[PDB]
């Protein structure tokens, strides 16, 4: 696999907007933890902080498209 699957990214991309309500192209924790709640997931202010923290890579304090292509890859 030298890049990625085109369909495996798909999926994850149409999973990516959905989340993305206000469609910005940023996933912001109260995005996060609305998703992570319908999950039945219930993370914490410092839970979704640290989460998005430990991928976000470029400094700017949410979870785009790229980003969160890496966090659900690393979920495996
Ligand atoms: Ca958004
Ligand atoms: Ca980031």
């Not at 149409?14 to 309500?21: G, M, R, V, W």
């Not at 109260?30 to 998703?35: F, I, S, Y």
């Not at 790229?66 to 495996?76: H, S």
Request: glycine letters at 8%.
């Amino acid at each position: 696999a030298d890049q990625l699957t085109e369909e495996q990214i798909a999926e994850f991309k149409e999973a990516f907007s959905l989340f993305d309500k206000d469609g910005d192209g940023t996933i912001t924790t109260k995005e996060l933890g609305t998703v992570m709640r319908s999950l039945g997931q219930n993370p914490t202010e410092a839970e979704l902080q640290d989460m998005i923290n430990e991928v976000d890579a470029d400094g700017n304090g949410t979870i785009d498209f790229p980003e969160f292509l890496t966090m659900m890859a690393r979920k495996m």
